[PDB]
Design a protein around this ligand. Structure first.
Ligand SMILES: [Fe+3]
Ligand code: NI
Length: 245
């Protein structure tokens, strides 16, 4: 939903100070080692989480008065603006700017570890993980366990998702203007087989499949997720390079 944007990957010239400089230096260490998709060491995860947990929106130069947090479009949900900070083959750092009612629709992060901090605003998050080795009603629909279903109002601390835990499938819906700082390791890559897949979600009771038995009081904790094709409305838009007078 941003991996189509053209950016200078591995850019040589950067200008960061303070917390952003520390964040960048920490990411270079945290994500450097092992084959693609390697989850960083637990010590390095804790280090990066703590660096991110010191960061306030002012430290990364965003505030809710910026134009990125307002949309006038009608017929669809508000445009979400992508602010590129840095990317290379091992990780990306970026900020998503959601006007009220902006959405990043339900999607996965295959082989990816993602650190996320809500910088300001009230955001609803729904997230899931697959139930491994479970029956399916159809090839494109799979059983998932609900992990998060809550509003978050900043100030908030950093969360983490893993390739197969911590809510690898999630949907973000802004209730007020929101800014989210994400560190994504590694980024999506269609050439590398890390596609961004989107889903429609359904209550457990919407599909009755043989070989699946869930107790009554646990059913609300599960969902069926159906793969669906990316739509133009899913995609974030670029920020203006030059914003004028
Ligand atoms: Fe995501
Ligand atoms: Ni993308």
């Amino acid at each position: 939903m941003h991996h189509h944007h053209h950016h200078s990957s591995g850019r040589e010239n950067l200008y960061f100070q303070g917390h952003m400089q520390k964040l960048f230096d920490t990411c270079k260490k945290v994500f450097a080692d092992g084959k693609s998709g390697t989850v960083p060491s637990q010590e390095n995860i804790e280090m990066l989480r703590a660096v991110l947990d010191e960061i306030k929106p002012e430290d990364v130069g965003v505030n809710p008065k910026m134009s990125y947090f307002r949309s006038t479009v009608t017929g669809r949900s508000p445009l979400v603006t992508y602010l590129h900070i840095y990317a290379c083959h091992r990780f990306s750092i970026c900020i998503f700017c959601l006007p009220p009612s902006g959405v990043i629709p339900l999607h996965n992060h295959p082989e990816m570890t993602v650190f996320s901090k809500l910088l300001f605003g009230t955001m609803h998050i729904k997230s899931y993980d697959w139930v491994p080795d479970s029956p399916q009603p159809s090839s494109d629909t799979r059983l998932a366990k609900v992990k998060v279903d809550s509003d978050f109002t900043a100030p908030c601390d950093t969360s983490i998702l893993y390739p197969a835990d911590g809510g690898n499938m999630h949907c973000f819906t802004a209730k007020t203007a929101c800014a989210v700082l994400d560190v994504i390791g590694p980024p999506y890559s269609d050439p590398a087989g890390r596609h961004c897949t989107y889903y429609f979600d359904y209550p457990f009771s919407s599909f009755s499949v043989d070989g699946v038995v869930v107790a009554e009081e646990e059913k609300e904790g599960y969902a069926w997720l159906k793969e669906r094709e990316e739509k133009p409305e899913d995609l974030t838009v670029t920020a203006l390079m030059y914003s004028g007078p």
